[PDB]
Nucleic acid binder design. Structure first.
Lengths: 46, 173
RNA sequence: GCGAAUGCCGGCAUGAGUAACGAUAAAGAGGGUGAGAAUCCCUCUCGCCGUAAGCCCAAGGGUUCCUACGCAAUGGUCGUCAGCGUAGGGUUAGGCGGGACCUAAGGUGAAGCCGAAAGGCGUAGCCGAAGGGCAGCCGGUUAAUAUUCCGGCCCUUCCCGCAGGUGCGAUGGGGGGACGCUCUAGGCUAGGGGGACCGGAGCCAUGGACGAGCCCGGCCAGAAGCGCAGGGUGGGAGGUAGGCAAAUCCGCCUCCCAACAAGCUCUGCGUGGUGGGGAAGCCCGUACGGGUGACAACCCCCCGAAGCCAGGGAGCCAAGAAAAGCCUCUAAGCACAACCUGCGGGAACCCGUACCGCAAACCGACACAGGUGGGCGGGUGCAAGAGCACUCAGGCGCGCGGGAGAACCCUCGCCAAGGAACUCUGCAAGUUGGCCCCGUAACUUCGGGAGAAGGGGUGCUCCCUGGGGUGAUGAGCCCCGGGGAGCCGCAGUGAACAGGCUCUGGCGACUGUUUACCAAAAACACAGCUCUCUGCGAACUCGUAAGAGGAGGUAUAGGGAGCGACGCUUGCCCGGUGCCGGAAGGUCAAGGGGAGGGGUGCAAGCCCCGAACCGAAGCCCCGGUGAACGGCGGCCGUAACUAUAACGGUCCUAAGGUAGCGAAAUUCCUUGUCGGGUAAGUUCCGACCUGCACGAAAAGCGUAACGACCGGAGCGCUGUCUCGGCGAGGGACCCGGUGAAAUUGAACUGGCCGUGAAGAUGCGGCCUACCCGUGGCAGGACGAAAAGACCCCGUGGAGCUUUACUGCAGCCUGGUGUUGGCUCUUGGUCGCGGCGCGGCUGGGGGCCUAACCCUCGGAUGGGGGGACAGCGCUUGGCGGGCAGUUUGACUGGGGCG
RNA sequence: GCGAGCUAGCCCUGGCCAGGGUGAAGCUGGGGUGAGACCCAGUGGAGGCCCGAACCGGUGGGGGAUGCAAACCCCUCGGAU
RNA sequence: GUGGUUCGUGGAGCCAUGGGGGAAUCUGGGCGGACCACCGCCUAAGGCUAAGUACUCCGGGUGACCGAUAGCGCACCAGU
RNA sequence: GAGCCGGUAGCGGGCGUGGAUCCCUGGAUGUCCGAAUGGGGGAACCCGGCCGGCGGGAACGCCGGUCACCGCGCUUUUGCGCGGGGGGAACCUGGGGAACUGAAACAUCUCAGUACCCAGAGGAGAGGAAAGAGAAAUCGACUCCCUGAGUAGCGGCGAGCG
RNA sequence: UUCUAG
RNA sequence: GCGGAUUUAGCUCAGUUGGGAGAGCGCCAGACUGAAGAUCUGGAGGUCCUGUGUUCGAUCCACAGAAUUCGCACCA
């Protein structure tokens, strides 16, 4: 059926992961956004 | 086999021996390993002729010995060449398997005349070089891609076309 | 202050005890446990797999895995069962995988390069993998682990010591690891098969046979020593105009040994010696059986790989990735202590394992007949084969069971007699379907259209005969004819997997590719043609300037394009338009450059307006331009006993349709008129051709082969149809268990003929009219779904278009700047047709060159160009490439009018 | 700001197409001429080539329409170095 | 050639600058809105400077502010 | 000031007026990530020099401590010793910077220099002793509140801005 | 430039 | 059924102060020639559509109607 979910450790991870977000302006942005703003955890945390 | 190599001599007094027939797949040029004196080599131009049994070179000196190549300065008039040495040492300055090279059809001071292989005419410059001899491309033309599409087999873009499209898509398109 | 917003939120009824149990691969019986078992445990019949419904490696998910307790809810019924609850416990590695090694894409990225800032790029080096590389295997052992735990057998790297050895000693160099595809020799395990040849546990019941009889198995792994087997390279000297920046390495030339020689990396024997070994098996559960003791056996011939040796060999073209090891060596230290070796002792980590894993544990929100990558996949039969029917090992019976067999939908099976007429349509289905022999038409780009079309063969028995693997060849095996005789049934690819063919036409040649959830086509794609911009630092595409792309391409090339094999052939017009060329003349921006006026000024002055002339592209004007846009006439007369026409008369246009074709899918008058096909034929197919409106390049006529394309016809054959009529399995119906769903103001809702806002159960008159239900059948409740997509209306919105409006991007362009020298020159001007001079200032031609840029070619120097130009500022211009707005009202429907 | 574990692509790097059929370049031999063209016979094994599994697809009909499913099941079909 | 200013090209200045020319050191040099005379102001083209206004994460106070569908959405194993 | 081992009430055991529980403030520890900075990296993991005990090395040898990124000055010498950077609800200035919508269209205009993004200062920045303002020869830092004033005024002189 | 047959 | 234009001496066509009308090719007479024809020489000739209106007078200026050629008849 091929949905769109097949997760890929390697993938998903990579792609998304503390770092990256960081590395980025943007990413970083929202991130520290989320952080306070909301609490929670985060991607990679995932 | 997905690679390049040589294209412009500028170390001379060297012994030019016609390496061999390594007809080559990568630029319409068919070249053979050119064996130098020391032993250092080079898949060199494909300027047709100069039989296997190598036997050539060039030089600040001379030696029209078909193929081979020196500066404009050092070159006859009424001569057919390639290794299009445009600017001062810019190595090759044209004629790629483009057999019909250029013909020092008249030179002038630090300016030597050239029949624009491609399809026009003007002048180069001083030392500027270029090796005579033909090309090598056996009319590398024609040949049928029959009931299939050589193309594809191209590895060479089916970058296919269109023009009629349904849309209003791509540059001047 | 609330019915009331298809309102929000929450609960709660509906339909409704009807609809569903997630594949029609079925079950049934005996015992056992339990409060209670169609749904659990043992056992015995039976059905479904079997290329899976097999074990395996992964990725993903992470305790789901085991064991003892337990069922409240999740398990679409139960439930003592669980991949559910609580509790305990389970997965160990120098040699398996990941790192402690290597790089391509790509990502990072000190230096370097450009941005308003954030940022962009990016060398080397680093990150980056089932690509490279790397040192093991078989058995046992628990409730779970296992190449890790046991044990038996096989190794590797580092370290210290000594023993022996030799210029060791970088990673800098060189080989070097290193490879495409299609195909195939030689050899060998995996794997399979026959053995009545060896071992052993019992049998035969029945008619028969104790017999080469039935049933199990007769293997798995290994130090090197060792012969079948290949598999990769040659051996010395010297020159090294000297490279691979530095010398001995390898590269290149010369003379000798230049073999089936010797060399160094996998299979067989084996065999050290170990294990397994089923049928046991006295103690013991004689049964959730098996844990564990006879003896086993331990052998032969047969078939044989789609990747085992191996980096093979042969062919081919579109011509097949980079860093550990091996040898050369500088720095450099060893050179009685540096590296190679030998023996002996010493060292060896970090994190990964359970079980699921063509899946209820993975994605689809669910135990959803959806998808998900690699490994032999057991046999018997069919020409072969992971296709097929039955079954081996192992897996499972779909998680809802009984019971009737009505209509009715599903899936499937059958028919006489006719045999498409059913109908838009042979849509469906049915014919036909497999191998061998015979046999094959029009046409052809001679390849093909052929599997064409059309027959005939096939089963099991015995006879004599010929072949290739069988180490000679002598129980063994295979491809095979042969021809003769003969047996049986309706049938002899017996079942199962398996073209219906033909005749014709149109388009597009063809294999294709594409609109995921309607459409695979005449749509794009093409191999192939033609115009065509481009000389590199290209031209176009992204980009704010760097820069990448292009392309380490270089005119047999790179980009722009309209058609789209091949054949035949593409004619007529550049008045407008785009463009290419021209640039002498008109024009005209910024600007130079002065007449002259103006304001204030006691006055020198001090600000503006300023115009004659010089002045850019552009536009105007001349030409060239059609596989550039685009276009390619009208009526009157005339031989025509009747009709254009052979001719003739003309008015306008830039010429004014040519060759081929034609009621084509461009022809509405039309089912046009003639012909054929038929019992009639508005589809076809041929021919005319007054072509309502074909036409050569968005080609034109045709064209073999080719198409899940479209349309036309014939045989062959069948419930498609003349109505069918029977039947088989599945719901529907009755039982037990569970138990939704949109819509609905509310309601005990009959027909009539009339009516109302003009198509009423509810209003009037009337006629039939008991109360409820279940199996049904669709008509009305203007039924449900959705605040019509068709419509108009809001001076709503969003996308594409051009001579819409404006504006920007880019491009061309005058003067100005970091854009410096030297000379050759003509024009204006005012002053003193003129000439002499003079300040003024305008045009322009030259190598140079010190910026600039580029250039490189091995260093910073040379080289090329050079006052360019890049590039900054203002000028002007093109400019739908893009961005933003706009394009009225009326309207006895919107529009056109 | 967020995304190519959707999908269209493009770069890098592996894996994969059971069987069978058709029989062009070639090379071997023979063939009247000077050599040859060129013929034939053998070998030979190409092709986006044919017949077909897995695998890729998803026309043509059948079911399904509060489905098994927000595209699936059934018969059927094309591609098959 | 743009800015800001009330100034949307205007009779349109001051200050700030994108390009090009490129003055003066006290009778110097801008200014008082085109410009000019005279008067009047100011002295640039470098720098530091607490206090007076703004804001609630925090802690307190107070409520013609609420009461579990109101209040921050979240009164306590919620940005879960 | 005399009770306690936190919300846990429960089992099993215990500190305490020769000043416990806890309230304060200053401590010492502060494992791994995170600007991360020793090096690499899919955060919370895996790799390296110097010192280090010497440590079981029973008749045989390891963690701990440590340390070191890079841009900033500059005592330059061979460069030794100081600052930064990352945050942070709201608020501040600079850097850059828009359509809707109003004008009952819409190109001028408006929303605005707003919303957003960026950088950066602070606890407050902003700004700040005048080549200023205006004209009574009058006033004087900057800022902020009221007022001046919806005035003088800008303009398809329209909506508005002001 | 053209002007039938006998 | 609506909008534009046209209906002139046999035929194709020109004319906006409107006030007075042609062009090219036909047709009859005279020449050239034995003869026709092409070709030089002169003339004959029209409701400028049918019927009306403004105006001194218009066919050219205007309003209806028949015949003529062309466009429009599209959305469900």
């Amino acid at each position: 059926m091929k949905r769109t979910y097949q997760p890929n450790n390697r993938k998903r991870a990579k792609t998304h992961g503390f770092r990256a977000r960081m590395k980025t302006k943007s990413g970083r942005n929202i991130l520290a956004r989320r952080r306070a703003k909301g609490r929670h955890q985060l991607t990679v945390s995932d | 086999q997905y690679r390049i190599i040589d294209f412009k001599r500028d170390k001379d007094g060297i012994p030019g021996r016609v390496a061999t027939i390594e007809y080559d797949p990568n630029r319409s040029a068919n070249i053979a390993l050119i064996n130098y004196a020391d032993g250092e080599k080079r898949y060199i131009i494909a300027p047709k002729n100069l039989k296997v049994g190598m036997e050539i070179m060039s030089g600040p000196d001379a030696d029209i010995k078909i193929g081979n190549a020196l500066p404009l300065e050092n070159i006859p008039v009424g001569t057919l060449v390639h290794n299009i040495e445009l600017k001062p040492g810019r190595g090759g300055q044209l004629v790629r398997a483009a057999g019909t090279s250029a013909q020092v059809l008249g030179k002038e001071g630090k300016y030597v005349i050239v029949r624009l292989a491609s399809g026009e005419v003007r002048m180069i410059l001083g030392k500027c070089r270029a090796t005579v001899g033909e090309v090598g491309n056996g009319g590398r033309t024609d040949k049928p891609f029959v009931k299939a599409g050589n193309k594809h087999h191209k590895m060479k873009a089916p970058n296919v076309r269109g023009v009629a499209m349904n849309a209003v898509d791509h540059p001047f398109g």
